[PDB]
Design a protein around this ligand. Sequence first.
Ligand SMILES: O=C(Cc1cccc(Cl)c1)Nc1cncc2ncccc12
Ligand SMILES: O=C(Cc1cccc(Cl)c1)Nc1cncc2ncccc12
Lengths: 304, 304
Amino acid sequence: SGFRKMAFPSGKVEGCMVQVTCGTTTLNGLWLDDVVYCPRHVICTSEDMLNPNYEDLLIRKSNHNFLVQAGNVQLRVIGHSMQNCVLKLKVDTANPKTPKYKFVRIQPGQTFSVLACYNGSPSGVYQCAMRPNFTIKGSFLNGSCGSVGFNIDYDCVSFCYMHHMELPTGVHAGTDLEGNFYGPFVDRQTAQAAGTDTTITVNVLAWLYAAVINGDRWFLNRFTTTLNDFNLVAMKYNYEPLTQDHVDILGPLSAQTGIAVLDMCASLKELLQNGMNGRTILGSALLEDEFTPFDVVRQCSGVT
Amino acid sequence: SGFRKMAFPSGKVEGCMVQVTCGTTTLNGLWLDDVVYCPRHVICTSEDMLNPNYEDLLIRKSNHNFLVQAGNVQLRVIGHSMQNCVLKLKVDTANPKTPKYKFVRIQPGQTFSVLACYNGSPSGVYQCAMRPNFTIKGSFLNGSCGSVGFNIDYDCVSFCYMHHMELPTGVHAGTDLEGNFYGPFVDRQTAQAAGTDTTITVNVLAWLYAAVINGDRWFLNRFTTTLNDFNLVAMKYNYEPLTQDHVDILGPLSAQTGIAVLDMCASLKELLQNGMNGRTILGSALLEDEFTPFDVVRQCSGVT
Ligand SMILES: O=C(Cc1cccc(Cl)c1)Nc1cncc2ncccc12
Ligand SMILES: O=C(Cc1cccc(Cl)c1)Nc1cncc2ncccc12
């Protein structure tokens, strides 16, 4: 028993981290097979960041300008190319520590682990969610760019995020491993609207099921609701509208606890309308939305 | 910017995890050099757990009864010995992935990362604190025994915890790597008093400094307090009494923010007396005590 904001073991990803330096800028790269992936803004200077002409900046660079170091050993760059907002540096050596991997584009509301890195060296690992507005509330400092987000299924690492930028609001933006930004963001030093965020309803419900499984039951009530009625409350409290597809993915947790999804919705409705009244659920005094239904079953069943 | 419950990268520890089976029981072992460490209750059956005579149970076992598997390869056991509540299985092969390591006994209130494992396979990593009452509020299921807690300083892993038991209250108990339990616990299936826990005051103060560094400042007030006055409030709210040694370790954060430790104590006093009034600090609606002053500076300075 017990429920924690658990991240995937980071070993398979640590073996892929490298340092990439171009000119005076240093950030992290991801070395998979004979390619190193990194944010294209490694080619910029501070005078460029207001609105960089990336095509022109990259034309001034040659393979030998990209210094790639894996720990203490230097990698030889034999090609470079820009794909969207990422650079792909072909190296003459395949990473011997390349795990089985995929590049995936995650949906908003899904979760992943981040391995925060500096100078190609891992500093820490944490779990987070891609917000419905395509931002992440991470922990990153200057030099963390190029750190990646991922999920692991057995021996396969599915890379879903590469960190690029911190918006003036302190929230984080990045790309998939093909260099496409999640959300409307551009890799420029400008104020950029993130847009209205919402709470991930399906994840809050999954976490209420985790709470029941792990002994916290004070919030269960004698009530039920409908999708329509619950969605009026979700509207009022800036929660994502619940659909039958969300009810369907909550099936396993509903079967495990014997609590019908709509009955759990009625508990969530009462907590939204009345608050926690000074009480806690799984060590939290707010409704947590960073655990998906899959995360709850995985943590409550010990998948390795 | 941003502040997360960050765990150490687990790679160095993943390389040490093995499966240990004795009779019908399977749990995790830690393979460092030519020794595998695991909880001694691997030698028990369910009939033994009420009050096992470990000495007698171990006398019935021979080296060949301990099956140790590192991934898919079997390790040859050439010796066994019980030290306190751990077994040390000498194997004929040094773990090639042994990192630089130490065995340390952590103090209550200090934090560490846990690599939860099942059948010698890592499942997830999370950060937690050793409670003042020597329990941990972890996330562990049946088979997680033998999972370890650790801290990393550059290339050295300091192992501080090995998981042994879940108390009937759902909280966790374990040992240092010499097999000494933290707290009064014994490795028996009995109800065992954990004793009064308290909130780690120095860690709450460190997290309030982290909040100020990362932009959350609404809780700062026009007041100051003394150690004596603050400790009367700490007494009332079941917080650890603050000492000058705690004020001294908060020095760096006080210098960084320009907020005198006693001024931050006055903010903590007001939050204890008035609550959060429906507001949050670093995404939490309660006062967080799982970040030490060292953790806050490390996360806010990007140590790798
Ligand atoms: O945001 C940037 C640089 C930057 C500026 C403009 C556009 C792009 Cl694509 C990249 N770097 C950081 C990332 N994450 C966190 C940070 N924390 C502090 C300072 C810097 C951070
Ligand atoms: O507590 C035990 C077994 C046990 C019983 C009595 C004494 C000792 Cl030293 C060990 N194992 C578990 C550990 N952590 C978490 C669990 N969650 C569920 C079931 C079992 C768990």
